[PDB]
Amino acid sequence: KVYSQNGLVLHDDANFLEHELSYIDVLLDKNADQATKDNLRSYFADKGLHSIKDIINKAKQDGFDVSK
Amino acid sequence: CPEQDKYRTITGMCNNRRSPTLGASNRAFVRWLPAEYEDGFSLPYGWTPGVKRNGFPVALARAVSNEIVRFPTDQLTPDQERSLMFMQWGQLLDHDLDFTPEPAARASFVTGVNCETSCVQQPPCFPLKIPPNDPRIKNQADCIPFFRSCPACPGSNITIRNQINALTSFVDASMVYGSEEPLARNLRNMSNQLGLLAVNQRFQDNGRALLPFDNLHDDPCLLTNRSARIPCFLAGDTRSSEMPELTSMHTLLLREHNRLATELKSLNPRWDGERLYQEARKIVGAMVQIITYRDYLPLVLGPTAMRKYLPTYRSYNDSVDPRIANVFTNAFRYGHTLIQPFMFRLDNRYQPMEPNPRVPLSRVFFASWRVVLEGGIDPILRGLMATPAKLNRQNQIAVDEIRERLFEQVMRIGLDLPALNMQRSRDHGLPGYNAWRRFCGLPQPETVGQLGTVLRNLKLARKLMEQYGTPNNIDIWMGGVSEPLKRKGRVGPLLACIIGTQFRKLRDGDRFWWENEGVFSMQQRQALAQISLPRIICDNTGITTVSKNNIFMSNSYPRDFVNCSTLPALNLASWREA
Numbered sequence: 353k354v355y356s357q358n359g360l361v362l363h364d365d366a367n368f369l370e371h372e373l374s375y376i377d378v379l380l381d382k383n384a385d386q387a388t389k390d391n392l393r394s395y396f397a398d399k400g401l402h403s404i405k406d407i408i409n410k411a412k413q414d415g416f417d418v419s420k
Numbered sequence: 421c422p423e424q425d426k427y428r429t430i431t432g433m434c435n436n437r438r439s440p441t442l443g444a445s446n447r448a449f450v451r452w453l454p455a456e457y458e459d460g461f462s463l464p465y466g467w468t469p470g471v472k473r474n475g476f477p478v479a480l481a482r483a484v485s486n487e488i489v490r491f492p493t494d495q496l497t498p499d500q501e502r503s504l505m506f507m508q509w510g511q512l513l514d515h516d517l518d519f520t521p522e523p524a525a526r527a528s529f530v531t532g533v534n535c536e537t538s539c540v541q542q543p544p545c546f547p548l549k550i551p552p553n554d555p556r557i558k559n560q561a562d563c564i565p566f567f568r569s570c571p572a573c574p575g576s577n578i579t580i581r582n583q584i585n586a587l588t589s590f591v592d593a594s595m596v597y598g599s600e601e602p603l604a605r606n607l608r609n610m611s612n613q614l615g616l617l618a619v620n621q622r623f624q625d626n627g628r629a630l631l632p633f634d635n636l637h638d639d640p641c642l643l644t645n646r647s648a649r650i651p652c653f654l655a656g657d658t659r660s661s662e663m664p665e666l667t668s669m670h671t672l673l674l675r676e677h678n679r680l681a682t683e684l685k686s687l688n689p690r691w692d693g694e695r696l697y698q699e700a701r702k703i704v705g706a707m708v709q710i711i712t713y714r715d716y717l718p719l720v721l722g723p724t725a726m727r728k729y730l731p732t733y734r735s736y737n738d739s740v741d742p743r744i745a746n747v748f749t750n751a752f753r754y755g756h757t758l759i760q761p762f763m764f765r766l767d768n769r770y771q772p773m774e775p776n777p778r779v780p781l782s783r784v785f786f787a788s789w790r791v792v793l794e795g796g797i798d799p800i801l802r803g804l805m806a807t808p809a810k811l812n813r814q815n816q817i818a819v820d821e822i823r824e825r826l827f828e829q830v831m832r833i834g835l836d837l838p839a840l841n842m843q844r845s846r847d848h849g850l851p852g853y854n855a856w857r858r859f860c861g862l863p864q865p866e867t868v869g870q871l872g873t874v875l876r877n878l879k880l881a882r883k884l885m886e887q888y889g890t891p892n893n894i895d896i897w898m899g900g901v902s903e904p905l906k907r908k909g910r911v912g913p914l915l916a917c918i919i920g921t922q923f924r925k926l927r928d929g930d931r932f933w934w935e936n937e938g939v940f941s942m943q944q945r946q947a948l949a950q951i952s953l954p955r956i957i958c959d960n961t962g963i964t965t966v967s968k969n970n971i972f973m974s975n976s977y978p979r980d981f982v983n984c985s986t987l988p989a990l991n992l993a994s995w996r997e998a
């Protein structure tokens with residue numbers, strides 16, 4: 353939902369967050385522990401983002417530059 | 421729900437096992453008195469012209485503010501015994517307790533009018549009309565925007581309108597961790613098993629963590645300095661960026677969490693991320709409760725009301741209603757009388773810090789760029805400790821930085837926070853001043869003279885009668901802050917009762933109260949009694965000289981300050997598992 357005070361949108365729980373880009377870096381890190389990447393994919397899966405493509409496209413949809 | 425558990429839920433669910441929704445987020449407020457609406461179930465008083473309340477016309481909130489609350493800023497009276505940290509903790513605490521959602525502006529696309537822009541009184545708008553000869557808004561066709569709070573029962577048929585509390589009523593540090601499972605996880609660092617909260621990835625504060633950035637397509641913080649492009653922050657409560665002073669307290673508790681989770685890891689290597697997160701969350705939650713009830717509330721209520729409304733704790737009581745009363749959301753706005761018109765920033769010497777050491781509040785609202793680009797949170801926290809709060813006088817209620825210029829950098833027009841409070845109480849159908857006096861067992865004045873006796877101020881009782889006509893119609897906030905302050909307190913008897921009662925229930929009706937048997941061990945409870953807000957500042961900032969307890973009373977440097985080496989650090993030795 354949307355948190356609104358005096359017409360200002362203070363939070364939108366549907367929007368990709370900036371610090372979640374560091375998670376994308378982990379997934380695309382070849383040497384990164386596989387059990388960690390699997391936990392991140394379950395994190396993103398719980399938000400409707402299943403393929404790496406869905407995750408990147410959501411971050412892009414929400415105003416972030418994707419070059420990965 | 422769980423036959424037995426150890427940590428509280430994020431939403432507050434099943435804190436009370438006999439009624440698992442009590443205190444849980446996204447539930448209607450509890451009403452200590454039946455709602456009073458113009459038409460009896462939804463319309464606020466002042467909605468329909470010519471419709472009186474108790475035989476008198478409804479007073480324009482903006483007019484009451486102009487004639488009662490307005491005073492010359494420069495004549496402000498400093499509080500000789502309250503720091504500006506006293507005000508700020510009240511705001512942060514309130515953001516642990518209540519948040520009343522409003523409809524988003526974009527819902528007006530194919531429906532109704534845009535309350536941001538239009539002055540048409542149409543759902544969901546309830547704009548404040550401009551009185552004649554207004555000192556700032558000289559166009560009476562204008563208005564101050566106002567969205568009605570969302571109803572607890574959408575639409576509905578003959579259901580007394582009520583409002584929703586999006587937060588957990590419990591004092592559980594939900595302004596850090598959130599009040600819903602998705603946000604709570606979004607706030608957490610899910611790339612390892614350390615149980616940390618997510619921190620900013622683009623900026624630090626002298627090597628120390630900053631809050632992560634929130635993502636808002638129409639971010640208000642970007643408007644405060646277009647070249648800086650610093651958006652608002654993300655925290656357990658969505659208002660974290662309203663003020664850099666507030667932001668600094670959020671940032672402080674975020675660091676404290678990651679500091680605790682770090683130590684607990686070294687202490688118990690076998691614990692996984694979830695375990696570390698929950699244990700550090702439980703300590704922080706107890707720290708907030710301790711600071712609130714041990715240090716803060718005694719200075720709000722004063723000794724007399726403290727002993728009366730918050731007697732010595734006994735044990736948990738599952739018959740206590742721990743919800744936030746609808747009236748508390750407005751009554752706890754007394755803190756607005758404490759607000760100074762500037763943000764004070766000091767250096768390591770507690771001297772004014774350049775660039776700007778005395779910034780008017782009308783240029784700090786949503787100014788997240790100031791935290792990131794103008795020296796972090798250390799200069800802010802130092803100003804909060806070594807600056808006196810504003811004292812509340814019956815002819816110096818609230819400054820004009822919030823009465824004339826609230827959010828003017830992100831709004832088509834400056835807002836009037838005192839007026840918003842009174843309009844808000846009407847939006848929530850709250851009873852008038854005498855209705856709450858009675859509820860609290862206090863005398864109810866009918867005439868200017870009797871009101872003069874209650875207020876010990878014949879002049880103010882006169883201006884209130886001229887605006888409202890009868891003391892029965894005085895909006896609860898206006899009447900609450902108009903009363904003389906109790907001995908060694910900063911609220912009158914009426915607000916001491918409402919505020920005192922609320923926090924009693926939040927203590928006695930909280931199964932996870934830090935002193936309740938089973939929550940912590942004996943060695944852990946004795947360890948937590950040693951914590952203090954000045955020590956938390958020492959542990960998570962570059963500041964090495966901090967206020968001496970009570971931090972909310974200490975407010976002058978170097979008289980009321982000590983070196984960080986003198987205070988004891990929290991001993992987590994009892995958190996060791998064999």
Ligand SMILES: *[C@@H]1O[C@H](CO)[C@@H](O[C@@H]2O[C@H](CO)[C@@H](O)[C@H](O)[C@H]2NC(C)=O)[C@H](O)[C@H]1NC(C)=O
Pocket residue numbers: 645647648775789793794
């Ligand atoms: C908005 O932010 C800009 C950019 O940060 C401010 O200009 C800076 O002022 C700081 C003072 O701490 C200096 O250290 C920098 O050299 C300045 N940066 C630039 C880009 O010149 C600017 O002052 C702010 N706007 C206002 C109104 O204060």
Ligand SMILES: [Ca+2]
Pocket residue numbers: 516517587588589590591592593594595
């Ligand atoms: Ca809470």
Ligand SMILES: [Cl-]
Pocket residue numbers: 450451452453745746747748
């Ligand atoms: Cl109520």
Ligand SMILES: [Cl-]
Pocket residue numbers: 515516517587588593594595596598599656657
């Ligand atoms: Cl909260």
Ligand SMILES: [Cl-]
Pocket residue numbers: 754757812900901902905910911912915
């Ligand atoms: Cl007061």
